[PDB]
Each structure stands twice: as structure tokens, then as C-alpha cells.
């Protein structure tokens, strides 16, 4: 849910420096928490052992 997309808003000049910032507002919402799942403690060693 996006309140606003990613955008830049320029800051005030308080010296010989140019400043600006980039902002984004939002939140992810999952309506059904029981229609997802996770695997934990998986072992994977692609650069394996030779010898």
C-alpha cells in the first residue's frame, strides 16, 4: 500500500552545500497469514569440499 511513490524533495541551503533527500511512504499488508510458509535451517554449500 503506497502513500506516495519514490520521489525527491529538495532541502534548504544553509551554506555552500547543495542538499536534497529521497523519500518513500508505504507498508506491506498480508491478509491471510496462513497461506504462506517458510523453510528454516537449510544447508547449502555450492563451493563444496574436494579431497
Amino acid at each position: 500500500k503506497q502513500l506516495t511513490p519514490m520521489m525527491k524533495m529538495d532541502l534548504a541551503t544553509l551554506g555552500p552545500v547543495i542538499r536534497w533527500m529521497i523519500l518513500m511512504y508505504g507498508v506491506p499488508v498480508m491478509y491471510a497469514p496462513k497461506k504462506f510458509m517458510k523453510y528454516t535451517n537449510i544447508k547449502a554449500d555450492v563451493p563444496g569440499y574436494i579431497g
Binding site: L3, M6, I22
Partner: protein, 52 residues
């Protein structure tokens, strides 16, 4: 049985700065403000991806 839930909006941001003499000297790689903006956008994208 029925329920009513609520979600709260959160905020993300970063700041980029360029000094005045950096804007005056002859710099390769093109414009500097655009480069800094692209770097900030990519950093924000990575942060959003990991926060998800």
C-alpha cells in the same frame, strides 16, 4: 466470526549532499547531481528489498 484489522504506514528516506566547488570543477562521468540521485535510488531500492 468476523474481524477488523488495521495497518500502519511507515516512512523511508535518505539524504544526498554535494559541495559547491564539486559543482564547479570539470568532472568526468557526466553530471554529478544525476549520479548522486541514481546512487540514492539504488541504495533505497536495496534497503526496501531487504526490509520486505
Amino acid at each position: 466470526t468476523y474481524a477488523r484489522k488495521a495497518a500502519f504506514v511507515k516512512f523511508l528516506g535518505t539524504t544526498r549532499e554535494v559541495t559547491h566547488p564539486m559543482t564547479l570543477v570539470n568532472s568526468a562521468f557526466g553530471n554529478v547531481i544525476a549520479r548522486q540521485n541514481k546512487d540514492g535510488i539504488l541504495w533505497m531500492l536495496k534497503q526496501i528489498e531487504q526490509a520486505l
